[model samples]
Target chain A: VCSCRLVFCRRTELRVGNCLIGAVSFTYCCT
Target chain B: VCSCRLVFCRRTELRVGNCLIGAVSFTYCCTRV
Candidate 1:
C-alpha cells in the first residue's frame, strides 16, 4: 500500500553543506 | 502551483547527522536513492 502523502520536500537551493550529495536537488514529496 | 509527488527523501541512517541543519531540520522527505 502507498502509505505516503503529498508533502512538499525541500528544494535544491536549501543546502546543508553541498546538498546532501544529491538528495537536495529538487522539490518532491514523501512519507 | 502545487507541484509535488509521493517521494521518499532520506532515512535516519542516511541522514549523515546533518539532517538537523539547513532546511532539512524540520520535516524532511526521508526517501530512498
Candidate 2:
C-alpha cells in the first residue's frame, strides 16, 4: 500500500513535501 | 461541506474534478490539495 502519483506547480521550485519539481512550486509526488 | 475548488492543467482542459480549467488537468483540489 505504497503508491503515489500527483503533480501541481508554480515556480521558484524544486521541493518535496512542500511540493515542487522541475520548475514547480508544490504538490508533486511520485512513487 | 459545500465548497469545491480545485485546479490541475493540460491541453483539452476545463474540468471540475478530473481537474482542469483555463488549461488544467485534474488533481487540483482547492482548500489545498
Candidate 3:
C-alpha cells in the first residue's frame, strides 16, 4: 500500500511519502 | 550596500537579501551547498 500526505508552504508544495528522505528530496516522487 | 541573512534548511539554504524577490528566488543568492 502507498501512503502519503500533503504539506503546503509558501511558494512550494510538499508531499510526505513512504520513503527514506521523507519529503521534498525528489521532485518526481512527490510532484 | 548589500544586506542579507541566511536561512538553513534540510536540503537547501535560503538567503534573504535587499532584492525584489525577498529570498529564494535568485540562483546566485542561495545555493544548495
The numbered model that scores best in lDDT is 2
* Cα RMSD for candidates in order: 11.2, 11.8, 13.6
Scoring each candidate complex against the real one, what DockQ results?
A: 0.12, 0.03, 0.02
Candidate order, lDDT descending: 2, 1, 3
Clashing pairs in 3: none
- Cα-based lDDT at residue B10, candidate 3: 28
Q: Which portions of model 1 miss their true places by more than 4 Å? A: A1-24, B1-12, B16-24, B27-33
User: Per-candidate interface C-alpha RMSD?
Assistant: 5.9, 11.0, 14.4
> Model 1, DockQ value?
0.12
What tens digits encode model 3's per-residue C-alpha lDDT throughout A1-31? 1112233422443332222122232211123
- Residue A1, candidate 2: Cα error in Å is 8.3
TM-score of chain B of each: 0.15, 0.19, 0.18
**Candidate order by DockQ, highest to lowest?**
1, 2, 3
lDDT of each: 0.29, 0.32, 0.27
Candidate 1 residues A1-31, lDDT tens each?
1112223434432222221223543323323
Model 3 misplaced regions, further than 4 Å:
A1-31, B1-11, B21-29
The reply for model 2, stretches above 4 Å from the true place, is A1-24, B1-24, B30-33
Q: In candidate 2 chain A, where is summed lDDT lowest over 10 consecutive residues?
A: A13-22
